[PDB]
């Protein structure tokens, strides 16, 4: 394995991650309806949880990537020549199956990266982050070159352009995966493992439960429907959550530098750090309830989402890096991997529970009156 093949493998893994998260990033960017995001998250978490326990075949990854591509094609054709009711029904079922397929693809790619030397999990995560950044950048570039016709609440030209970009990325990732990857071929009981590393599980569910509680439907959906935020400004608001969330997962990794010495601190301090994250709930609600000019400001709205974005990824990698320090009775190498399975499961429950509790705020009269 010389430098050329290693570089190609790193590139194809980064590209697999990028093309897997492209669909979610463009669904966020296009201001799609909230229930579609909820369906996508539900499908993704269900598929990931199911695939964690079942050793699904590793040959099927290109097939489901092609299924994702044809689903994007169906999205385009439905936005083109389908009426509102059939478009809604399609888009919802397509988003459910898209979430399922994306979760399966992520699981298969991570399993491929793990069972090989010079792991590519870091490369896949970097690919996901670059997917978020790339979607934001192309959306910003595309905003001033597309007329906002707003056919079904989604810009026709923007949807077509973003989805053809996603399709070309998906097919070129397909060819990269086919060319590069080879698709031929005494432990303690779980109760003791759970009762020992319970803080790490709880500290990871809480951060993902709260972040996905707000950003989907209250992070920018309720702000724009209560303050009439322009579509140009919404892209900056939503698109800067996905550029600071990716940038926030690195500083924990470069702990050797003096500046980032205190970024990974402890597990006990993480619970009290997630309690301070609960102070984001009044701030997000206050941004959609007061007309006083400071709250109706693009920079404040951007910064308020930026702070949540930074504390999301930074608090999502810390429990992975410090939970081994807090372990007392789980000492074997096999239990370390088993506990890590509980952590990723605890996140998907956090994402699944995060989206659905957004409907709690529907009871409150948060949104300002139209006149």
């Amino acid at each position: 394995l010389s430098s050329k093949q290693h570089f190609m493998l790193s590139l194809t893994f980064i590209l697999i991650g990028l093309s897997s998260l492209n669909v979610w990033n463009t669904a966020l960017g296009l201001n799609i309806n909230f229930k579609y995001n909820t369906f996508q998250i539900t499908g993704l978490v269900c598929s990931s949880i199911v695939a964690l326990f079942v050793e699904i075949p590793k040959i099927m990854l290109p097939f489901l990537l092609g299924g994702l591509s044809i689903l994007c094609a169906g999205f385009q054709i439905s936005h083109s020549f389908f009426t509102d009711t059939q478009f809604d029904t399609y888009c919802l079922v397509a988003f459910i199956v898209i979430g399922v397929v994306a979760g399966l693809a992520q699981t298969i790619a991570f399993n491929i990266g793990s069972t090989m030397e010079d792991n590519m999990g870091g490369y896949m995560s970097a690919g996901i982050g670059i997917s978020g950044v790339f979607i934001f950048v192309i959306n910003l570039l595309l905003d001033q070159f597309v007329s906002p016709e707003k056919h079904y609440g989604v810009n026709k030209a923007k949807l077509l352009a973003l989805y053809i970009i996603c399709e070309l990325c998906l097919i070129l990732a397909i060819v990269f995966c086919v060319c590069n990857l080879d698709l031929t071929n005494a432990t303690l009981s779980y109760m003791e493992l759970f009762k020992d590393s319970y803080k790490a599980i709880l500290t990871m569910f809480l951060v993902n439960w709260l972040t996905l509680q707000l950003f989907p439907g209250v992070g920018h959906k309720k702000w724009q429907e209560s303050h009439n935020i322009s579509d140009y400004n919404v892209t900056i608001i939503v698109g800067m959550f996905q550029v600071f969330d990716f940038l926030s997962r690195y500083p924990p990794n470069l702990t050797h530098i003096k500046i980032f010495k205190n970024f990974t601190f402890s597990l006990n301090k993480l619970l009290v750090a997630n309690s301070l994250r609960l102070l984001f709930i009044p701030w997000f609600i206050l941004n959609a309830c007061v007309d006083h000019p400071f709250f109706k400001n693009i920079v404040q709205q951007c910064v308020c989402m930026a702070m949540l974005a930074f504390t999301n990824g930074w608090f999502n990698t810390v429990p992975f890096l410090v939970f081994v320090k807090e372990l007392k009775k789980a000492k074997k190498k096999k239990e370390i991997e088993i506990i890590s399975t509980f952590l990723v499961i605890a996140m998907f429950v956090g994402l699944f529970c995060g989206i659905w509790t957004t409907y709690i705020y529907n009871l409150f009269n948060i949104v300002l009156p139209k006149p």
Partner: nanobody
Amino acid sequence: QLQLVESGGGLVQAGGSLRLSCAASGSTSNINVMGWYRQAPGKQRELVATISSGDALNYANSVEGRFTISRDAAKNTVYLQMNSLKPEDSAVYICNAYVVSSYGYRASWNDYWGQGTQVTVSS
């Protein structure tokens, strides 16, 4: 890359005592648990003793009460003390590291092995 340096092996009489030093240079803080593995000639690899980052002590059932392994987080060096050596422990001990690569939403672990030292006891 990640490099491991081991020293202390040799030929000593039965019931002796040796101190094995293992140090890491490439990865500084991502190491979670370091340990020692022995491989007898004509035999498969086996675990000897591992110390985690949170001072968690693991041992093989055949070395309990005889081997003491200590860590020095200041320079990322792990030392193993062997007491009352016996002929069946004649093997090659290779230091091992356990690095977590967890850039987010997925934790993956790697094993880094040094060249190891040959320890033989006879007479």
